[PDB]
Short mmCIF file of C-alpha atoms in Angstrom, two decimals:
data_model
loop_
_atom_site.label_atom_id
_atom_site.label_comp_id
_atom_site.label_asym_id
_atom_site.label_seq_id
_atom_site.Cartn_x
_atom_site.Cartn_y
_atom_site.Cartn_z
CA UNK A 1 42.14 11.97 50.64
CA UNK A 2 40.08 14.87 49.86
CA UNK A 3 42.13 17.90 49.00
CA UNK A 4 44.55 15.89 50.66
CA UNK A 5 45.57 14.81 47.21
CA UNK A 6 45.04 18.68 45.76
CA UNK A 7 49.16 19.15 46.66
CA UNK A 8 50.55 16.08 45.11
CA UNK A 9 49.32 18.03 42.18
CA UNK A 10 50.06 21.70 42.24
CA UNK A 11 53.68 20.78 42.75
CA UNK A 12 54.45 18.64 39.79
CA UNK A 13 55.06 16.00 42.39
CA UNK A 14 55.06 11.90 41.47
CA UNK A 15 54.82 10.87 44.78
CA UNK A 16 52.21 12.35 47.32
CA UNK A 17 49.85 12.00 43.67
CA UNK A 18 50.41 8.16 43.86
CA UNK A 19 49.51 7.61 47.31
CA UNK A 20 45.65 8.94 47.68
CA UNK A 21 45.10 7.24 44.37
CA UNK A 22 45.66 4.31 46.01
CA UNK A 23 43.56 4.64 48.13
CA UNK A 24 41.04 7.17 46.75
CA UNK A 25 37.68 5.33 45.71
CA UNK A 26 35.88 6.04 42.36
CA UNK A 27 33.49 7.68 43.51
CA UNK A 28 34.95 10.12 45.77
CA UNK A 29 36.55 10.82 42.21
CA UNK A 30 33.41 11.13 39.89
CA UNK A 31 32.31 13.87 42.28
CA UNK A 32 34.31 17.22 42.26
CA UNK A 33 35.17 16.19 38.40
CA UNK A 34 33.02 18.77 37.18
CA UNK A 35 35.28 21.37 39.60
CA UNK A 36 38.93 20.34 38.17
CA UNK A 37 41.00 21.28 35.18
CA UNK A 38 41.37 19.58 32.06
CA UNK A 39 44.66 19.12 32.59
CA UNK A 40 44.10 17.19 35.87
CA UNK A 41 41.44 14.74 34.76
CA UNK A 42 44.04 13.37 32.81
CA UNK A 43 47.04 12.19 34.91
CA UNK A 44 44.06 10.88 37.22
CA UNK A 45 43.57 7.85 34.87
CA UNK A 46 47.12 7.51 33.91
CA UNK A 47 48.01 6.98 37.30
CA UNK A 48 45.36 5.38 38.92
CA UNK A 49 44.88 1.53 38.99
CA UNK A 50 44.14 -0.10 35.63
CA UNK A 51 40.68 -1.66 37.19
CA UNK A 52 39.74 1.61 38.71
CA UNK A 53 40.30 4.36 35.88
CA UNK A 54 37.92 2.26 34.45
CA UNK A 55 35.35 2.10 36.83
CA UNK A 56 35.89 6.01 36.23
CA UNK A 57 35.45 6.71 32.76
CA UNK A 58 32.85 3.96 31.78
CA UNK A 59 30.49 6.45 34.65
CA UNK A 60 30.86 9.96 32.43
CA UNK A 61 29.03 11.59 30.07
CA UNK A 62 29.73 10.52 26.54
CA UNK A 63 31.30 13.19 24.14
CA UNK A 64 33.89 13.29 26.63
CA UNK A 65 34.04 9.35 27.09
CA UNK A 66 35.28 9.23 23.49
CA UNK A 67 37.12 12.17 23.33
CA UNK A 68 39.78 11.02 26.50
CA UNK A 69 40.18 8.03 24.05
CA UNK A 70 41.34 10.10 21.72
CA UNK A 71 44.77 11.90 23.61
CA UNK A 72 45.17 8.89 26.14
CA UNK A 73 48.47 7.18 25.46
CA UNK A 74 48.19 3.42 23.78
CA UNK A 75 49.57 1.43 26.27
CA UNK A 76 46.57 3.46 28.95
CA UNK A 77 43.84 2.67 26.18
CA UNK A 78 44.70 -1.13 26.40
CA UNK A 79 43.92 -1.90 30.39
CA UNK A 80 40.96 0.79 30.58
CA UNK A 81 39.40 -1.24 27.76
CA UNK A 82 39.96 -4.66 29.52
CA UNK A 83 38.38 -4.07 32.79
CA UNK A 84 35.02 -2.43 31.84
CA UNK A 85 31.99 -3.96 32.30
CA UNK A 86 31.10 -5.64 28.69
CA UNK A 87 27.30 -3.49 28.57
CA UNK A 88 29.88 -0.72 29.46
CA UNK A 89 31.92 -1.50 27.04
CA UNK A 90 28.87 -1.41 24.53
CA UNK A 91 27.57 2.02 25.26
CA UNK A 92 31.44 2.91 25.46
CA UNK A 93 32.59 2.51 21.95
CA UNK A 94 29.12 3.57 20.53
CA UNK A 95 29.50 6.62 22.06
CA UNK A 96 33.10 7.48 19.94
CA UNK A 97 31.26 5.69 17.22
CA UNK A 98 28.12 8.07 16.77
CA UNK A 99 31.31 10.90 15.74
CA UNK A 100 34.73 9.33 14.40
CA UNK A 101 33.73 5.67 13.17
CA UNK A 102 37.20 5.99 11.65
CA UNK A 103 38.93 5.54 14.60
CA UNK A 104 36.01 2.62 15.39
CA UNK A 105 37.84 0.18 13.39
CA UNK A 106 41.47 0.93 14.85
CA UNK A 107 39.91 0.68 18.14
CA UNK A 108 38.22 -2.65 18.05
CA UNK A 109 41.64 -4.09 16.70
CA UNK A 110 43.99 -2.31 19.53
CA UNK A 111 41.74 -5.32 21.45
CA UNK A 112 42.11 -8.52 22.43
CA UNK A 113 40.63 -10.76 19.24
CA UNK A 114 38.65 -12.84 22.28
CA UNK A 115 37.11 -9.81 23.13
CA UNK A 116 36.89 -7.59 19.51
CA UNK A 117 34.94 -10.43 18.49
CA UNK A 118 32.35 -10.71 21.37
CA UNK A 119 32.15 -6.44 20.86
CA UNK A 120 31.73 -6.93 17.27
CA UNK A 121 27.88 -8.75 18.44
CA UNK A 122 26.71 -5.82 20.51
CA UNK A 123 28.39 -3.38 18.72
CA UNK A 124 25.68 -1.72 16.79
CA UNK A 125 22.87 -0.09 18.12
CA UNK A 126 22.60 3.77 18.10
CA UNK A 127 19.45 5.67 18.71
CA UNK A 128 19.51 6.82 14.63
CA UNK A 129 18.63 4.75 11.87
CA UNK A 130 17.05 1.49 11.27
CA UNK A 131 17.66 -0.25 14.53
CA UNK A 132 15.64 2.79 16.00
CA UNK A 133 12.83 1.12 14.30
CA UNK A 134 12.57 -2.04 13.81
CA UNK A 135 10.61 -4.36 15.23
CA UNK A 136 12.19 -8.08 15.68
CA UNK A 137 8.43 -9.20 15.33
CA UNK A 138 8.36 -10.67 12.22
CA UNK A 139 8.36 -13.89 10.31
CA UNK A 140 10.86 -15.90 8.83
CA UNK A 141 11.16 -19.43 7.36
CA UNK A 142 13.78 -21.73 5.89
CA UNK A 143 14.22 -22.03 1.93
CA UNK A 144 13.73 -25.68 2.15
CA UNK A 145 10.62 -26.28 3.92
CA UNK A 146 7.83 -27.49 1.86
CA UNK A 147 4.52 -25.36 1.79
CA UNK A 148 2.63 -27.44 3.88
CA UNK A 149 5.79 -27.08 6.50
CA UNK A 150 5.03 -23.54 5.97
CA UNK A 151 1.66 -23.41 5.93
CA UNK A 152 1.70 -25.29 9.13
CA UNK A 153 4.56 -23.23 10.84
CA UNK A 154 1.46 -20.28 9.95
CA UNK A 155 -1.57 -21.05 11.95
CA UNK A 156 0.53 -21.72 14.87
CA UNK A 157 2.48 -18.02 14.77
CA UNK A 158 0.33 -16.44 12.55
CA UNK A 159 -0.94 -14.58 16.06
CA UNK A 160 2.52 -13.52 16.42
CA UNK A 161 3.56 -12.34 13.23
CA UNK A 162 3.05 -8.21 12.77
CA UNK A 163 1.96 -9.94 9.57
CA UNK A 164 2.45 -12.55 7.16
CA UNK A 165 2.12 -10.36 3.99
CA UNK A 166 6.09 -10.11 3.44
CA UNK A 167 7.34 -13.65 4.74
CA UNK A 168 11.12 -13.71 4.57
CA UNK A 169 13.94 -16.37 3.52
CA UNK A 170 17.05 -17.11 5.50
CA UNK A 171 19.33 -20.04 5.72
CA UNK A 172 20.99 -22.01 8.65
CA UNK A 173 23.14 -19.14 9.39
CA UNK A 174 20.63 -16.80 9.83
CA UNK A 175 21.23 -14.58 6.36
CA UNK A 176 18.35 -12.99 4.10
CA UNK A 177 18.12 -15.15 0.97
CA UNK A 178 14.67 -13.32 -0.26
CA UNK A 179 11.07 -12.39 0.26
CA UNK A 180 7.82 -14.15 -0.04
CA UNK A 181 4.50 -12.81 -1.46
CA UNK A 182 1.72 -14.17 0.44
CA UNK A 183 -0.05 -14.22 -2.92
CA UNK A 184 2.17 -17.29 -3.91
CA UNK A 185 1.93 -19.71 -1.33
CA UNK A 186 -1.67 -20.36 -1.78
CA UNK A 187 -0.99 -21.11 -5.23
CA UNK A 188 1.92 -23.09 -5.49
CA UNK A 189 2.28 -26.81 -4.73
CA UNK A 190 2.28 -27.78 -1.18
CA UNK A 191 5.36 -30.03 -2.44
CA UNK A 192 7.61 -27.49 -4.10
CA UNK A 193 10.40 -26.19 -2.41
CA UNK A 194 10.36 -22.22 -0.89
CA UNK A 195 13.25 -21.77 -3.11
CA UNK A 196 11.33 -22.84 -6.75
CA UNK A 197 8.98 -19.93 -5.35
CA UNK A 198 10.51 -16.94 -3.56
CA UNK A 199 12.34 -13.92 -5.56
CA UNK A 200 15.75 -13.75 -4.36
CA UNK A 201 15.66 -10.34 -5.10
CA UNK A 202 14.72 -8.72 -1.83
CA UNK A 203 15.29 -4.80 -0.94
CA UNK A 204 17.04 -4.72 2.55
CA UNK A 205 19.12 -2.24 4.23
CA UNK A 206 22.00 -2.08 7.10
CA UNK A 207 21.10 -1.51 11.13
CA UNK A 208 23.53 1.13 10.59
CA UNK A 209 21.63 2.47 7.00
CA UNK A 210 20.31 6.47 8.04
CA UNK A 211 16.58 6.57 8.37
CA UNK A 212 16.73 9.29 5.65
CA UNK A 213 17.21 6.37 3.26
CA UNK A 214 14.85 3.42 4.47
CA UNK A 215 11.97 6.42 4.04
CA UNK A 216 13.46 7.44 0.82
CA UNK A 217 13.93 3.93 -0.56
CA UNK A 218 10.85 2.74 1.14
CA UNK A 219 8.42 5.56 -0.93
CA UNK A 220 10.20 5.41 -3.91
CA UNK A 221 9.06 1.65 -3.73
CA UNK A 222 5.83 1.70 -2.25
CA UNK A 223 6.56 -0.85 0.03
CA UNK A 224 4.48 -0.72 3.14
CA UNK A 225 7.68 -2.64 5.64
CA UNK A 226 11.49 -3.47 4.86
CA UNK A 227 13.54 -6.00 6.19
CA UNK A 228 16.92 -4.83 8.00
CA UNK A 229 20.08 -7.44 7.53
CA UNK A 230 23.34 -6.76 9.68
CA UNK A 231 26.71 -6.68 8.64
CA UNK A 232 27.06 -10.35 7.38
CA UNK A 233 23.72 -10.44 5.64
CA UNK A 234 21.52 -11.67 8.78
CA UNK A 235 17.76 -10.71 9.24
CA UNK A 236 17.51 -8.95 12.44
CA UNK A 237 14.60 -6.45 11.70
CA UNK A 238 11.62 -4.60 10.11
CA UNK A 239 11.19 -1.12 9.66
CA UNK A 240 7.85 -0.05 8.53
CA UNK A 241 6.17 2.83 7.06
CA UNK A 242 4.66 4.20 10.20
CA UNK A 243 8.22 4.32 11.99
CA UNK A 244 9.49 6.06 9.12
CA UNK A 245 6.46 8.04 8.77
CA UNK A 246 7.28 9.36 12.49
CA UNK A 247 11.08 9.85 12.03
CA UNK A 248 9.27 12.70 9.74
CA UNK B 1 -38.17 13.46 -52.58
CA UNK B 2 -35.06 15.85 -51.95
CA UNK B 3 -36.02 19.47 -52.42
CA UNK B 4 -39.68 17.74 -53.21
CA UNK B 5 -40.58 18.32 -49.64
CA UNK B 6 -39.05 21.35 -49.16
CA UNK B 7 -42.38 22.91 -50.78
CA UNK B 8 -44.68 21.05 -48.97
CA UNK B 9 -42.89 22.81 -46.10
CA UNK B 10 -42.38 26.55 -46.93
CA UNK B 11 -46.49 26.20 -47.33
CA UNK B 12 -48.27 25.07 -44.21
CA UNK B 13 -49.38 22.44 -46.35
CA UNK B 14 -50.70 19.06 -44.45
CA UNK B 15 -50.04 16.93 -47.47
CA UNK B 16 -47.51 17.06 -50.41
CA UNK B 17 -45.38 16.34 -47.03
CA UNK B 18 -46.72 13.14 -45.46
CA UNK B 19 -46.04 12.21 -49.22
CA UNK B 20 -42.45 12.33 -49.56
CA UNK B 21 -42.19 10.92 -45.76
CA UNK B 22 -43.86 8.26 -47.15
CA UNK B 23 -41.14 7.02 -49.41
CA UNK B 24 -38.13 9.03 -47.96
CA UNK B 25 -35.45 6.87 -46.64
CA UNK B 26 -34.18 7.71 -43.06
CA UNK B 27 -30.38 8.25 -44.74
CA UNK B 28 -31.72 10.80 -47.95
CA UNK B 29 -32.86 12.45 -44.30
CA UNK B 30 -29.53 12.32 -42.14
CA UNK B 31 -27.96 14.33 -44.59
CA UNK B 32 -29.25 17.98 -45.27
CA UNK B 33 -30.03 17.88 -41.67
CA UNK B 34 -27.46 20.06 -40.25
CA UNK B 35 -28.26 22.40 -42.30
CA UNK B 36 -32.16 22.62 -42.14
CA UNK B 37 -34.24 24.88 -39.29
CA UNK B 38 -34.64 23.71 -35.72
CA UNK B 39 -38.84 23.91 -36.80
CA UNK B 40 -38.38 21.53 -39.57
CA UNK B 41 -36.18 18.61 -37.56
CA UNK B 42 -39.62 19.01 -35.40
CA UNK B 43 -42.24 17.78 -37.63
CA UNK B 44 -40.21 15.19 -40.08
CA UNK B 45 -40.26 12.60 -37.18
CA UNK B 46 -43.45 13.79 -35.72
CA UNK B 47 -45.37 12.86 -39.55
CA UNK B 48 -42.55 10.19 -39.63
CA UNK B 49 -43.96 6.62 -40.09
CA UNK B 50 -43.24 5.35 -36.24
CA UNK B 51 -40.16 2.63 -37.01
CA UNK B 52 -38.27 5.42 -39.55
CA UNK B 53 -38.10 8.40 -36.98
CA UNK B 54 -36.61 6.12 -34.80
CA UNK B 55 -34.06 4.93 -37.38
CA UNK B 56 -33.02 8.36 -37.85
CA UNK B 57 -32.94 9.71 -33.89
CA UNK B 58 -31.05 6.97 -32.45
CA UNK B 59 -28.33 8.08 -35.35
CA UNK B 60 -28.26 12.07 -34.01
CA UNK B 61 -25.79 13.53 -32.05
CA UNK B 62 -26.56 13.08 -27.67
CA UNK B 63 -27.51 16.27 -26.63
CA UNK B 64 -29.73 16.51 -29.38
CA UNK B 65 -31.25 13.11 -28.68
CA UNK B 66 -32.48 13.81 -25.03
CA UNK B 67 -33.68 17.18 -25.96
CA UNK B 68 -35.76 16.13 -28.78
CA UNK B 69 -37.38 13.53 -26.00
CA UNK B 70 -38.31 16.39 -24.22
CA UNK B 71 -40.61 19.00 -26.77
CA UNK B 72 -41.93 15.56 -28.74
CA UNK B 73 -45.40 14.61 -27.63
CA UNK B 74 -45.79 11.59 -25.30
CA UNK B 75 -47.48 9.84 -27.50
CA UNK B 76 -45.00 10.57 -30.30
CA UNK B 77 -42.42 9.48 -27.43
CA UNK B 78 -43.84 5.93 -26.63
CA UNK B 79 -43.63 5.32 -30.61
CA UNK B 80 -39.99 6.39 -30.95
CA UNK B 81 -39.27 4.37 -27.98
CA UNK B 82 -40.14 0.93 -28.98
CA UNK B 83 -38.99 0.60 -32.47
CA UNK B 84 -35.02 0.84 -31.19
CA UNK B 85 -32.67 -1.45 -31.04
CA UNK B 86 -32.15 -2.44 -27.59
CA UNK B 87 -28.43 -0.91 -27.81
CA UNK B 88 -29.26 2.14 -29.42
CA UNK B 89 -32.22 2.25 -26.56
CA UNK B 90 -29.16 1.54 -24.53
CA UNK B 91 -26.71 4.62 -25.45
CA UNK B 92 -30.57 6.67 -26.31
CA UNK B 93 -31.56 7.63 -22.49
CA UNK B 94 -27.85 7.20 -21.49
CA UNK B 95 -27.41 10.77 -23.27
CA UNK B 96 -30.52 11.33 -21.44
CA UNK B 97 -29.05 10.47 -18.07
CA UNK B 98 -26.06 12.48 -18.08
CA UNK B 99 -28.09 15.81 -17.47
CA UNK B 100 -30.96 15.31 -16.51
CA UNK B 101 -31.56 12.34 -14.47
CA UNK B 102 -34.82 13.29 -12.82
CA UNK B 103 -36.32 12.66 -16.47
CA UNK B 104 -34.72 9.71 -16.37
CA UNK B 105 -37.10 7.87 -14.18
CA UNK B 106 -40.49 9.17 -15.49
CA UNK B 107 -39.01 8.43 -19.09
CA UNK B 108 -38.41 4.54 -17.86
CA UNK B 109 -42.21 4.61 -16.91
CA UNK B 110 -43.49 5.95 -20.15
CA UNK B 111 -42.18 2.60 -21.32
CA UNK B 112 -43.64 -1.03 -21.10
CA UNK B 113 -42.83 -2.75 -18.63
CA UNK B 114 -41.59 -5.62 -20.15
CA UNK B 115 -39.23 -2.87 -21.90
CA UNK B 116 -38.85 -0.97 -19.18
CA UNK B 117 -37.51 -3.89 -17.11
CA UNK B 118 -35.10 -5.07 -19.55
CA UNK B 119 -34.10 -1.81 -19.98
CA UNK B 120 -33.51 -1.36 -16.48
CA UNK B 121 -29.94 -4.11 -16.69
CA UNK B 122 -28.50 -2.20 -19.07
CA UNK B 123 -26.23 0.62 -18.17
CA UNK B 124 -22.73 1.66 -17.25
CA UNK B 125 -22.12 5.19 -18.52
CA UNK B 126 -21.16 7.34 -15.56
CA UNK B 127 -18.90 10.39 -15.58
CA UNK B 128 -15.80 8.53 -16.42
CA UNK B 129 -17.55 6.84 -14.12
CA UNK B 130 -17.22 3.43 -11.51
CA UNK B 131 -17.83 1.52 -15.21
CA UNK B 132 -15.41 3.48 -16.53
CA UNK B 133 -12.62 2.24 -14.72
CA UNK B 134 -13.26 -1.10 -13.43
CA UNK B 135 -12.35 -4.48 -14.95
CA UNK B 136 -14.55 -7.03 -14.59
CA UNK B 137 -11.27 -9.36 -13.81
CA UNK B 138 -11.38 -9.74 -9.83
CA UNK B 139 -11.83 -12.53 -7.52
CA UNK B 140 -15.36 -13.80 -6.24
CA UNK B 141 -16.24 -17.04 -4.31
CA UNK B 142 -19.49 -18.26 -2.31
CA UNK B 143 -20.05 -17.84 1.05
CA UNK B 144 -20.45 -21.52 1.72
CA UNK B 145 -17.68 -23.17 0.39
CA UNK B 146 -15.08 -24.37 2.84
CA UNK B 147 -11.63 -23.05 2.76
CA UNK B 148 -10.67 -26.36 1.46
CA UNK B 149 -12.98 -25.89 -2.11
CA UNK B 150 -11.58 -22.16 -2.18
CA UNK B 151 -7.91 -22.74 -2.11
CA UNK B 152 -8.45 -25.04 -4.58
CA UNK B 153 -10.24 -22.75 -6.65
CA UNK B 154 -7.03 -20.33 -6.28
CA UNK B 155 -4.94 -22.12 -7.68
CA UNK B 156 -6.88 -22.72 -10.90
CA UNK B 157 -7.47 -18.99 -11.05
CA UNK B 158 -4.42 -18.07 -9.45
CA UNK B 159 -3.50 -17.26 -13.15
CA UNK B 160 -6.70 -15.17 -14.24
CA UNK B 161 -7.32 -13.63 -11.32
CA UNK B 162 -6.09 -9.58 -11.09
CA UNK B 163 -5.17 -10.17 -7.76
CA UNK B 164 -6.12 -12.62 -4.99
CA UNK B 165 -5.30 -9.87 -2.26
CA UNK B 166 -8.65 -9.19 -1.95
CA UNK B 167 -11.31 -11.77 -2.42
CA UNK B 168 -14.91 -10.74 -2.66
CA UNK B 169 -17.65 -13.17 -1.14
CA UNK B 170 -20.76 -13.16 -2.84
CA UNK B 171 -24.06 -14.83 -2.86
CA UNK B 172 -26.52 -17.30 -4.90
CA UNK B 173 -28.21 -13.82 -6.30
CA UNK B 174 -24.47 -12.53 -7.18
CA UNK B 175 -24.92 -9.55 -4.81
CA UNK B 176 -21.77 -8.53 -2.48
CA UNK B 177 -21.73 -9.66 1.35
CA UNK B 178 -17.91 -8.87 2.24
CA UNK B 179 -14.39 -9.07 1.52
CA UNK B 180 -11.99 -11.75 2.93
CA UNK B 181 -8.34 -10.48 3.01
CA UNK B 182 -5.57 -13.30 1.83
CA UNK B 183 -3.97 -12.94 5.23
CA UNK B 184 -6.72 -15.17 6.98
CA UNK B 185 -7.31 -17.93 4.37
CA UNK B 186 -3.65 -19.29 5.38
CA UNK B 187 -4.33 -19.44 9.11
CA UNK B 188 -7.81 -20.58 9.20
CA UNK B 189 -8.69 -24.02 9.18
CA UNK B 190 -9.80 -25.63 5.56
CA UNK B 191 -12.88 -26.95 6.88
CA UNK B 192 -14.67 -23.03 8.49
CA UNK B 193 -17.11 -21.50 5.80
CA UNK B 194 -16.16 -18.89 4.57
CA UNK B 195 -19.02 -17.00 6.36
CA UNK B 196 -16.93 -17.46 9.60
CA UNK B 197 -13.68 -15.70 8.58
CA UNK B 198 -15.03 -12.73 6.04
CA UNK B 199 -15.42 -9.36 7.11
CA UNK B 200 -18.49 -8.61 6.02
CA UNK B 201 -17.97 -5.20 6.16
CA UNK B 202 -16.66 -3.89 3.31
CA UNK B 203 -16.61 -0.69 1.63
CA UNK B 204 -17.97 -0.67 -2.22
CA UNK B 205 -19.43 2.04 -4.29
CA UNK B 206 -22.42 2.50 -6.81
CA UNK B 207 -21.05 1.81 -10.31
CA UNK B 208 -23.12 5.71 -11.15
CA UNK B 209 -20.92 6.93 -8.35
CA UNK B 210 -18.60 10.12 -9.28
CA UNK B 211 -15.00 9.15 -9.97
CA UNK B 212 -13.84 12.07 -7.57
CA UNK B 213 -15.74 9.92 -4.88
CA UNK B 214 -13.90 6.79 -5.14
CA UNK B 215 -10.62 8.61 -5.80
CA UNK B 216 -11.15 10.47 -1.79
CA UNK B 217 -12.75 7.23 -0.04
CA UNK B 218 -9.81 5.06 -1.65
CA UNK B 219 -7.42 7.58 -0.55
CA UNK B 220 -8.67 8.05 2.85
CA UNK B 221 -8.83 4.84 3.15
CA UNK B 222 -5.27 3.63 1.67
CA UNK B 223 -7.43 0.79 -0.55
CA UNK B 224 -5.00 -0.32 -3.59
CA UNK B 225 -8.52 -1.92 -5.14
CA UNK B 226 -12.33 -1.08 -4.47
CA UNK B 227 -15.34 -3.43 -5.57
CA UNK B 228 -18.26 -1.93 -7.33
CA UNK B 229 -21.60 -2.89 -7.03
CA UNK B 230 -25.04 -1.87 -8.92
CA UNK B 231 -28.37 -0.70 -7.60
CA UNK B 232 -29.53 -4.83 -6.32
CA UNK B 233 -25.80 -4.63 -4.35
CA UNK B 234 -24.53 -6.73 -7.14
CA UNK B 235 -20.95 -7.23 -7.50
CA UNK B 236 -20.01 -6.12 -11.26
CA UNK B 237 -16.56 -4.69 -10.78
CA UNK B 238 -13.09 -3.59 -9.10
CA UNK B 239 -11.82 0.19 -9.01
CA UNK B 240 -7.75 0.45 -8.78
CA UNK B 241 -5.87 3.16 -7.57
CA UNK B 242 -3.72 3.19 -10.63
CA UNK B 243 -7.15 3.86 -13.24
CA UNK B 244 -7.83 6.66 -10.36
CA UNK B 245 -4.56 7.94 -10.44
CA UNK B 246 -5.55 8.74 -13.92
CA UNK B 247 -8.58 10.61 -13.53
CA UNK B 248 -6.44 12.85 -11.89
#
């Protein structure tokens, strides 16, 4: 099934093309690849099994993974999508992502709502920008625990906690509400609520924010770290001064 | 007893001027002064009844002041000496100090000890210098008393207190023994002293010491405050970044 397929093709011929696709494994695919035409990478996919084409594409390098999403036809960018591997769906869309997020959006809908939801949660991490940073070692609290809750919770992770200088807010959901200067808790009330004492008013910044900013935003400021929210307001990160220091 | 003396001058003559020094008042003096000869400024306080030609140097401009204590006998110098007021004894060998230092010391000796001594807790004027900046609003506590008396003690001063970011630990004498950083009062229990949680090495600075000194150690260093101490290692002060920021 070797060049025993290389005929089917230089004839313009829908049948003898068909047959070693069948029965022509992925791999024995991914290998000459880098030998063929543009032209015949393309009616490769198109013909081949929905579960295999797949088991093609989510293997190559990326500028081309996002660019064969761009000229294959709909109805071939619906059962590609389906059968990958959900991590290889992740590094998949990321990779068209990183140039056209445009087409992002038209792309996550062209799914299946089950499964543009459960994308939506991975979909996010690039090499550039604040998740490039950020270390998910840092504390957090709820804005109804009293200060001796607090205090409590901060003996017991305080050897966990990249420090407890810039203690942040969230509620059930999981979503930034404010910051908290250490210099307050050992003044207020061990009774008062960590609402009546944190400032709402808390500088964050998206996963997806460039790094250019978060060093921009974070001198202007003088702030030594920065918490890093999501898409629905949810505390996921800090990026610091050193990380930022680094990304030069 | 204006131009009255100035015969008893032009002439060599020993006594029609101890006569108008006699009755002339140290202000009548003050005045023509600036326009008189260095020679004459010379032997007015040397004839000068002991408690006038004080009266009338501790009102003279500095660097006149320190270099008419050094061409005036020493026993014309002890005289001077003890018939200031202690503040204009204070701001007298201050001008002293500023150039010549070395002086400074056999100048302190020249006095009585009981002078000298009291003397000796006076100062502050450096070269824009550690006093010069410093506000004698920080934090201080005793080593002894448990974490329990100090937070309680925070949150009375909370409110008067520059900044409990960095609190200074001090003892019966009032001299410095280390800084405890707000980060560890939270996590350590409320009964530890204090001596088992403060670094005790921490970095302070003579209150004489040049303002380009503190400006490079708190920059090296990336300090935001810096506690100033005097020659017993006494804590009398806090240097900020912002006051050094403004030295240029």
């Amino acid at each position: 099934l070797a060049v025993s397929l290389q005929e089917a093709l230089q004839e313009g011929d829908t049948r003898a093309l068909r047959e070693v696709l069948e029965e022509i494994h992925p791999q024995d695919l991914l290998a000459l690849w880098d030998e063929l035409k543009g032209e015949h990478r393309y009616v490769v996919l198109t013909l081949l099994p929905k579960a295999k084409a797949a088991e093609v594409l989510s293997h190559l390098s990326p500028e081309e993974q996002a660019e064969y999403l761009k000229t294959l036809p709909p109805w071939r960018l619906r059962e590609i999508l389906e059968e990958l591997s959900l991590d290889d769906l992740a590094d998949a869309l990321q990779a068209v992502r990183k140039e056209d997020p445009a087409y992002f959006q038209r792309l996550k809908d062209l799914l299946d709502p089950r499964t543009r939801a459960e994308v939506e949660a991975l979909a996010r991490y690039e090499e550039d920008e604040a998740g490039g940073l950020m270390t998910p070692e840092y504390v957090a609290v709820r804005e109804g625990m009293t200060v001796e809750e607090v205090l409590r919770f901060l003996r017991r992770a305080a050897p966990d906690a990249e420090t407890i200088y810039y203690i942040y807010v969230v509620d059930e959901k999981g979503r930034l509400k404010g910051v908290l200067s250490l210099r307050d808790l050992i003044v207020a009330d061990p009774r008062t609520r960590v609402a009546e004492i944190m400032n709402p008013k808390v500088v964050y910044v998206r996963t997806d924010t460039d790094q250019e900013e978060v060093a921009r935003l974070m001198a202007d400021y003088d702030f030594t770290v920065l918490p890093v929210v999501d898409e629905e307001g949810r505390l996921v990160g800090i990026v610091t001064v050193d990380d930022v220091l680094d990304v030069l």
